[PDB]
Amino acid sequence: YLEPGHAADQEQAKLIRSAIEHTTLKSVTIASEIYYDPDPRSTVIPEDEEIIQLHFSLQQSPWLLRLELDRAAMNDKDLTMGQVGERIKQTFKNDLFVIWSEDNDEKLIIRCRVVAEEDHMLKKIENTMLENITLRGVENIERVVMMKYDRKVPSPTGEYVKEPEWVLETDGVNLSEVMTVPGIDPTRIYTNSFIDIMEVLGI
Amino acid sequence: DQENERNISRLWRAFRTVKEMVKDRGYFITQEEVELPLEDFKAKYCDSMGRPQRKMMSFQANPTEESISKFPDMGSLWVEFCDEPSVGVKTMKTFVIHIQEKNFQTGIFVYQNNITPSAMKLVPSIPPATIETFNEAALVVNITHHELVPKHIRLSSDEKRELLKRYRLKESQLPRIQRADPVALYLGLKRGEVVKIIRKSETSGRYASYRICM
Amino acid sequence: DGPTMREITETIAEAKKKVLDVTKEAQANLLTAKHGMTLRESFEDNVVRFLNEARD
Amino acid sequence: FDMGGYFIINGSEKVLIAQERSAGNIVQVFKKAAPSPISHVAEIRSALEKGSRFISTLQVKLYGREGSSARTIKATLPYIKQDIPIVIIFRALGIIPDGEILEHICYDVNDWQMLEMLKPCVEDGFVIQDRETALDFIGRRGTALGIKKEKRIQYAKDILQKEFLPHITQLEGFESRKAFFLGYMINRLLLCALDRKDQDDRDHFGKKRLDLAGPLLAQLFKTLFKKLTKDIFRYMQRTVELAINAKTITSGLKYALATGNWGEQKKAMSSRAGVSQVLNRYTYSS
Amino acid sequence: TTFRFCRDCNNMLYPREDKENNRLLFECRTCSYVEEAGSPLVYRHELITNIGETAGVVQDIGSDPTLPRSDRECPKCHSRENVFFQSQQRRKDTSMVLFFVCLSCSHIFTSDQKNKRTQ
Amino acid sequence: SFNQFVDYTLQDIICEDSTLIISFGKIYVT
Amino acid sequence: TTFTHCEIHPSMILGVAASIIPFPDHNQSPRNTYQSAMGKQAMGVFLTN
Amino acid sequence: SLMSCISVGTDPMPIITFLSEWGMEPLEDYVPHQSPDATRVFVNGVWHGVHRNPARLMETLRTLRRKGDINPEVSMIRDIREKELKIFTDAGRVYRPL
Amino acid sequence: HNGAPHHAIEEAESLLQFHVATYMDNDIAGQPQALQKSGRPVKSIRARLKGKEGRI
Amino acid sequence: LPHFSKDDYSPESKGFVENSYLRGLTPQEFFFHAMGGREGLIDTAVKTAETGYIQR
DNA sequence: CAAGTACTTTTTCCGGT
RNA sequence: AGGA
DNA sequence: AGTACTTG
Ligand SMILES: Nc1ncnc2c1ncn2[C@@H]1O[C@H](COP(=O)(O)CP(=O)(O)OP(=O)(O)O)[C@@H](O)[C@H]1O
Ligand SMILES: [Zn+2]
Ligand SMILES: [Zn+2]
């Protein structure tokens, strides 16, 4: 249940929807590839030549990790390449060198290079990425839905009047966290798992 | 600016809830003190770069006038906020003897991420005084405020004596509240302490239950 | 009634078209999947719903 | 009007109720559930038409979960404890170089997708590099073990001959025939794993056989005729130098058909009961 | 991807980097064989796969009676004789888009009123 | 099914692994 | 136009018990599963001998 | 059902002999990358080999049964898509006349 | 009491333990069920008291 | 059913019984009604036990 | 350590192998 | 094996 | 059909 004010605010509803519904790098990816691109300043891939030109102007591994992201998926689950990349960038910190094609650019690509024996290590980094990286939402919370539940409320004139509100239905449970989220009513929140309610809110 | 702004809001939220809990326990706290705005909290406890200085937050609380009538031996409380995400045996022993000397009755320790099992071994160290651990993250939202959460009320040793006399009970016979119950934690319920629970009823309009502590 | 039977017979016929319409649409990739549903899950819900609307 | 199709056992009309069963010698792939190490399994319940009837089932398993690093294909062999990586079995069959092993599994030299999935199996079975060291590796893992170098290699030979994929052949030199089938199983396994084919319907009537009065009797008769065989041996042995018990056959048939307990004998469970029942005669239709 | 094998062994080839001349090789780990890489691509994942949509389109696709027929003219030969089916890729997500196979030239075309293919 | 058992299957079981150090020829059903 | 075979009669999908039911295509399916179990509790001539 | 029957159980050998003498490559001799799309032939889940033109083969086997030469209770299926021709001489299979 | 062939005692002891075990409970984890000469197993005292049908 | 062409999603193929009991059912309609009906008889048989023990 | 295993209460009350 |  | 239990 949304914050007391924003009842009919469908946009506030969409905001929490995105802020709580869990998204992983796997969900957005089309395919991941491993290339031997030895010179980092030049590129065997001609498409990427453009991306190198900019993510350079305004020491590392010769082995490349190149993953193509889906446009349509980066939409229903609103996403910027910048915010996707920044996640990867913030996971491996300074053990990985990350470059990415712009939101405008025709194909959506993320170029990764590491800081004897390599081939296997990069194929390990790809699972640590697809499976182990979260972009949006909270863990255990899946397919979040927007609902316009009908609510009865006393009017200024005193009569009980139909004043419906925007509500969110989850397809997973994590009470401990969704409560702390800004923009909700942590006084009205309810989960069908009562085992959880007793744990968080008392017997 | 970035996303530093959220951890600021979250710390202030957690603070309000501590102020709320302390008032509720039976300590002299103002309504103006609880409802202190986000803007006021910033310019009070934030350094030269607007980063929250938790060492400043730490406060002392004295019983309300009313509290000394029901619970006379209710001493003063110490609330300690630490700036280290992991609290070590070094900073713990500081606060432990702080209570022992200032002769406090109770003491709350609000930590960010963890408390080392080294520091945790010093909690029952200073009797009759008592210590309480509290994860800041849990304190963001006051559970007591929830729809489903009724008014729990701690009973005086004489009130429990009467409750049992009046209902012809043995301590066994009463419903139990676990010592680790969020509400038994909020009120700092001790073993044997009884709560009077007042819930609304679709049946009678008002129903009074009782729960003994574990 | 014969007229009530005509009316019922044509009620089913229109529902069967409404279904075929969504069927040609989904085979031509034009269907827009409902948030939190397969493209198919979306279609079947619609088909099942038109058929039940009709039965009633 | 009486139709027959029933027996008369000690004056009562006994009926043999047709017993449903899952058909034998059939390759089927099933997606093994979410909290399992194995993600997909190729099963084949291989039995001989007649000849002791081996209930030996071959399990070609795809280890590792969806999105887990190192997804290997291992197979469970009759009278072998551990799950042998496919490659070793091929090497134990004589198919030694990877590529000749890969030819048996993936039929298209173009399909990279399936081949990428086979790279780990090659990496697993890399240690063993000849037919000999492959039979020793299988021989090492018993059964129990049966300690002796010459012994274990001599065993795995017999298991693959007599026990592994016992339909096709139980005979000697047929290594190529069995190896192309194992490859057909691994192909059917990966086809399902790469979402190209469907998980087999364990509820398809075509994959089910109803055992009627005849085969039911044969199962019983074979059990009994081999029980008469051991009695013939006992009389021959005692004759340290024409009395062969006809009761055993008569009685056993009479017992099972009377009791409905399709087993041996008054000492039944686990056997199979409810098979033979008394013919309903309330109505002709009944 | 499309990978090679070692001549002499037949055993599969593993990558090796030639740091000195910055080039990819493929060593045999059974014998001493080595050969330069054809492509700079070593591994491909493919999460949103499309390979297996038009499997088993054997020229006998017409002889299956179980298959439905349509009166859609071929994009190539303009023949109104075709056998159609849905994406033979057995995933939940999959769209209902049809694949038509000509009963004269045997060219494959869709009902996809969004995308222009060649498979 | 029963007829198949008597006419064929019975003769199979009678001599599939029968022979003992004593073999079994044709079977007769009265 | 692809028909390989034809159905001899669609009432042959039914077994002995269901086959005695008049107009079963005019009944709710379980009512037939019912009658298919009752005719076994009926009475009549079971054999002439 | 009234029309259903069960397969009594026939001998595979005359079919196995027939298939080989009708263009069947034995599995022992098969070479996957030479003959690629060859329809693979099975007789009771026993892979006997491959055949280059199943269309002709399916027709010969179908018309053999339909004449009476192949036992009528024997079932033979041609999955063109999967490229398989499976035959069942098997006992216990429930069938219906059409 | 008589000629004690040391092992022959730990033998007869383990059998007595078995009988006094299977008398009170026949349906034990350690599989060998005490079966009456007929194959049918012996009715334990525990078996007499076990739920729905039987004493309680 | 084998009386339908492949990849048929039409109401008639997926089991929509267009006819009334007064009018009678087609063989396809009949068998589909049968599949559905049998599902009820199974869930009564299953639940009737679960439900009894809940009460206990 | 985990998977896959056994048991268990697994609805009630009413002719005879 | 049947009955509500 | 589920749950603590049990054994690999
Ligand atoms: N296995 C069982 N256990 C306990 N009670 C049962 C039972 N089976 C049937 N009953 C009882 O018998 C009653 C009648 O069920 P049925 O004989 O099948 C006719 P019905 O289902 O009630 O539909 P109807 O009144 O429109 O004809 C049930 O409501 C129930 O109380
Ligand atoms: Zn080599
Ligand atoms: Zn054409």
Q: Which of A103, A125, A133 is nearest to A33 (CA)?
A: A125
Residue E59 structural domain? 46-119
Q: What are the angstrom distances between the C-alpha of B119 and each of B91, B133, B137? A: 8, 11, 20
Cα of D254 to ligand 3 centre, how many Å? 69
- Taking residue J34's Cβ as centre, other Cβ atoms within 10 Å add up to 19
> Which residue in the block uniquely carries the two structure tokens 């003994």?
B212
Q: Could you please report the per-residue DSSP string of H23-80?
A: T-EETTT--TTTS-SPEEEEESS-EEEEES-HHHHHHHHHHHHHHTSS-TT-EEEEET
E47 contacts A26 by C-beta, under 8 angstroms: yes
Cα(A80)–Cα(I8) distance, integer angstroms:
83
| Same domain flag for E60 and E115 | yes
Cα(B16)–Cα(J51) distance, integer angstroms:
49
Q: Is the CB of I15 under 7 A from strand M?
A: no
D68 contacts D34 by C-beta, under 8 angstroms: no
Cα of E35 to ligand 2 centre, how many Å? 11
Parallel/antiparallel/unpaired status of strands A29-36 and A63-69: antiparallel
Q: Is the CB of D277 under 7 A from strand L?
A: yes
Q: Do D195 and E43 touch (CB under 8 A)?
A: no
* E20 annotated to bind ligand: no
> Computed over its alpha carbons, how large is the radius of gyration of chain F?
10
Cα(E16)–Cα(E24) distance, integer angstroms:
6
Which bound ligand lies closest to the C-alpha atom of E107?
Answer: 3
User: Mutual orientation of helices C39-55 and C2-27 as an angle, nearest 10°?
Assistant: 170
Cα(E25)–Cα(B27) distance, integer angstroms:
76
Q: Could you please report the per-residue DSSP string of A56-116?
A: T-----SEEEEEEEPTTHHHHTT--HHHHHHHHHHHHTTSEEEEE--SSSSS-EEEEEE--
Q: Which amino acid is at B203?
A: T
Q: Within 13 Å of residue H28, how many CA atoms lie on the same side as its CB?
A: 6
G2 contacts E63 by C-beta, under 8 angstroms: no
D19 contacts D216 by C-beta, under 8 angstroms: yes
Cα(D232)–Cα(F17) distance, integer angstroms:
13
Residues β-bridged to residue A68: A31, A109
Cα(C26)–Cα(E112) distance, integer angstroms:
9
Residue A35 structural domain? 10-136
Q: Which residue is nearest to nucleotide M2 (CA to C1')?
A: J50
Q: Which helix (H) or strand (E) holds F1?
A: none
Q: Which of D194, D158, D202 is nearest to D26 (CA)?
A: D202
- The burial class, CB within 10 Å (0-12 / 13-18 / 19+), for E63 is middle
DSSP state of A90: H
Tokens of D24: 């034998």
Q: Is the CB of D34 under 7 A from strand K?
A: no
Closest nucleotide over all strands to I51 (CA to C1'): K9
* E28 annotated to bind ligand: yes
Closest Cα of chain E to H76: distance in Å?
Answer: 15
Q: Which amino acid is at B91?
A: T
Longest dimension (CA), chain I: 50
Q: Is the dihedral of CA F15, F19, F25, F27 positive or negative?
A: negative
> Which residue in the block uniquely carries the two structure tokens 């309610």?
A197
Cα(D102)–Cα(D109) distance, integer angstroms:
9
Backbone angles phi, psi at D110, to 5 degrees: -80, -55
Cα(H81)–Cα(C10) distance, integer angstroms:
40
Longest dimension (CA), chain J: 51
Q: Residue A158 CA to chain centroid, in angstroms? A: 44
**Helices assigned H by DSSP within D141-174:** 149-154, 157-158
Cα(A119)–Cα(A98) distance, integer angstroms:
18
F27 vs D: CB within 8 A:
no
Terminal CA-CA length for chain C: 17
Cα(G41)–Cα(D281) distance, integer angstroms:
10
Q: Quote the Cα angle for E69-E71-E74, to 5°.
A: 100
J20 contacts J5 by C-beta, under 8 angstroms: no
Q: Quote the Cα angle for A22-A27-A33, to 5°.
A: 140
Going along I1-56, which residue ranges are E strands?
A: none
Q: Do G15 and H1 touch (CB under 8 A)?
A: yes
Which residues have C-beta within 8 Å of that of residue A16, sequence separation ≥ 6? Answer: A2, A168, A181, A183, A184
Cα(E22)–Cα(A37) distance, integer angstroms:
9
Closest nucleotide over all strands to D278 (CA to C1'): L1
Three-state secondary structure call for residue F21: coil
- The burial class, CB within 10 Å (0-12 / 13-18 / 19+), for B64 is middle
| Same domain flag for E55 and E91 | yes
The 3 state secondary structure assigned to A137-201 is CCCCCCCCEEEEECCEEECCCCCEEECCEEEEECCCCCHHHHCCCCCECCCCCCCCCHHHHHHHH
Which residues have C-beta within 8 Å of that of residue A143, sequence separation ≥ 6? Answer: A21, A170, A171, A172, C36
Cα(D183)–Cα(D164) distance, integer angstroms:
14
Tokens of A98: 């990350």
- Taking residue H18's Cβ as centre, other Cβ atoms within 10 Å add up to 16
Residue D152 structural domain? 25-201
Q: Which amino acid is at B208?
A: A
Per-residue b or e along B68-77, where b marks 16 or more CB atoms closer than 10 Å to that residue's CB = eebbeebebb
Which residues have C-beta within 8 Å of that of residue A50, sequence separation ≥ 6? Answer: A101, A105
A146 contacts A117 by C-beta, under 8 angstroms: no
- Taking residue D18's Cβ as centre, other Cβ atoms within 10 Å add up to 15
Tokens of D248: 């055993």
A43 contacts A49 by C-beta, under 8 angstroms: yes
Cα(A185)–Cα(A7) distance, integer angstroms:
11
Q: Within 13 Å of residue D58, how many CA atoms lie on the same side as its CB?
A: 30
Cα(E88)–Cα(E85) distance, integer angstroms:
8
Q: Which helix (H) or strand (E) holds E26?
A: strand E23-28
**Helices assigned H by DSSP within chain A:** 10-20, 25-28, 49-54, 73-76, 81-92, 119-130, 175-178, 194-201
> Computed over its alpha carbons, how large is the radius of gyration of chain H?
14
Q: Is the CB of D269 under 7 A from strand K?
A: no
Q: What is the CATH number of the domain that holds A21?
A: 3.30.1360.140
Cα(B31)–Cα(B38) distance, integer angstroms:
15
Q: Residue D273 CA to chain centroid, in angstroms? A: 24
Cα(B213)–Cα(B192) distance, integer angstroms:
5
Backbone angles phi, psi at D89, to 5 degrees: -60, -45
- The burial class, CB within 10 Å (0-12 / 13-18 / 19+), for C44 is middle
G16 vs D: CB within 8 A:
yes
Q: Where on strand K do bases come within 7 A of a protein Cβ?
A: 2-4, 8-12, 17
Closest Cα of chain E to D126: distance in Å?
Answer: 9
Cα(A122)–Cα(A174) distance, integer angstroms:
33
Tell me which fold the domain B142-214 belongs to.
Answer: Eukaryotic RPB6 RNA polymerase subunit (3.90.940)
User: Which homologous superfamily is B1-141 in?
Assistant: RNA polymerase, Rpb5, N-terminal domain (3.40.1340.10)
- The beta-carbon neighbor of H98 closest among G8, G15, G19 is G8
| Same domain flag for E17 and E29 | yes
Q: Which of D152, D166, D11 is nearest to D77 (CA)?
A: D166
Three-state secondary structure call for residue B56: helix
Q: Residue A13 CA to chain centroid, in angstroms? A: 17
Q: Which of G36, G41, G45, G38 is nearest to G15 (CA)?
A: G36
H54 contacts H39 by C-beta, under 8 angstroms: yes
CA of D35 to C1' of M2 (A): 17
Tokens of A68: 């193509």
The count of residues in chain D is 286
Cα of J31 to ligand 1 centre, how many Å? 25
- The burial class, CB within 10 Å (0-12 / 13-18 / 19+), for B153 is middle
Backbone angles phi, psi at A173, to 5 degrees: -135, 135
Which residues have C-beta within 8 Å of that of residue D39, sequence separation ≥ 6? Answer: D31, D32, D62, D63, D64, D65, D66, D71, D193
Going along B4-121, which residue ranges are E strands?
A: 59-61, 77-81, 86-87, 106-111, 114-115
Residue H61 structural domain? 9-90
Q: Is the CB of I29 under 7 A from strand M?
A: yes
Closest nucleotide over all strands to D17 (CA to C1'): L1
Specify the number of domains making up chain E: 2
Q: Could you please report the per-residue DSSP string of B7-28?
A: HHHHHHHHHHHHHHHHHHHHB-
Tokens of B44: 């009070």
Backbone angles phi, psi at I18, to 5 degrees: -55, -50
D159 contacts D78 by C-beta, under 8 angstroms: yes
Cα(D77)–Cα(D84) distance, integer angstroms:
8
Closest-approach residue (CA) in chain E for G1:
E65
A84 contacts A110 by C-beta, under 8 angstroms: yes
Q: Which of A193, A201, A187 is nearest to B185 (CA)?
A: A201
Cα(J7)–Cα(F15) distance, integer angstroms:
52
Closest nucleotide over all strands to I29 (CA to C1'): K6
Tokens of D266: 């008054």
Q: Do G42 and D2 touch (CB under 8 A)?
A: no
Tokens of B16: 């309000």
Q: Which of D148, D126, D130 is nearest to D139 (CA)?
A: D148
Q: Do A130 and D68 touch (CB under 8 A)?
A: no
Q: Which amino acid is at D95?
A: I
Three-state secondary structure call for residue B68: helix
Residues β-bridged to residue B52: B46
Per-residue b or e along E47-62, where b marks 16 or more CB atoms closer than 10 Å to that residue's CB = bebeebbbebbbebbb
Residues lining ion ligand 3 (Cβ < 5 A) are: E 74, 76-77, 79, 102, 105, 107
Q: What are the angstrom distances between the C-alpha of C44 and each of C31, C50, J9? A: 12, 10, 9
**H contact test, residue of G8, G21, G36 with most H CBs within 10 A:** G8
H41 contacts H85 by C-beta, under 8 angstroms: yes
Parallel/antiparallel/unpaired status of strands D83-85 and D73-76: antiparallel
Three-state secondary structure call for residue C39: helix
H31 contacts H49 by C-beta, under 8 angstroms: no
* E1 annotated to bind ligand: no
Q: Which of D54, D27, D85 is nearest to D159 (CA)?
A: D54
Cα(A181)–Cα(A179) distance, integer angstroms:
5
C5 vs E: CB within 8 A:
no
DSSP state of G24: G
Cα(I52)–Cα(D228) distance, integer angstroms:
44
D208 contacts D38 by C-beta, under 8 angstroms: no
Q: What is the CATH number of the domain that holds D168?
A: 3.90.1110.10
| Same domain flag for E21 and E67 | no
Cα(D160)–Cα(D174) distance, integer angstroms:
10
Q: What are the angstrom distances between the C-alpha of B155 and each of B28, B158, B187, B193? A: 19, 8, 11, 7
Q: Which of B3, B114, B120, B7 is nearest to B54 (CA)?
A: B7
Cα(A143)–Cα(B166) distance, integer angstroms:
53
Cα(G12)–Cα(H5) distance, integer angstroms:
13
> Which residue in the block uniquely carries the two structure tokens 């990286």?
A133
> Computed over its alpha carbons, how large is the radius of gyration of chain D?
24
H88 contacts H95 by C-beta, under 8 angstroms: no
- Taking residue A177's Cβ as centre, other Cβ atoms within 10 Å add up to 14
Q: Which amino acid is at D166?
A: P
Parallel/antiparallel/unpaired status of strands D208-211 and D19-22: antiparallel
Q: What is the CATH number of the domain that holds E16?
A: 2.20.25.10
Q: Is the CB of G38 under 7 A from strand L?
A: yes
Q: Which of D55, D120, D90 is nearest to D181 (CA)?
A: D90
Tokens of B212: 């003994």
The 3 state secondary structure assigned to D45-71 is ECCCCCCCCCCCEEEEEECCCCCCCCC
Q: Which amino acid is at D147?
A: I
Q: Is B188 left (phi over 0), alpha (psi -120 to 50) or beta?
A: left
- Taking residue B80's Cβ as centre, other Cβ atoms within 10 Å add up to 24
Backbone angles phi, psi at G4, to 5 degrees: -90, -40
* E73 annotated to bind ligand: no
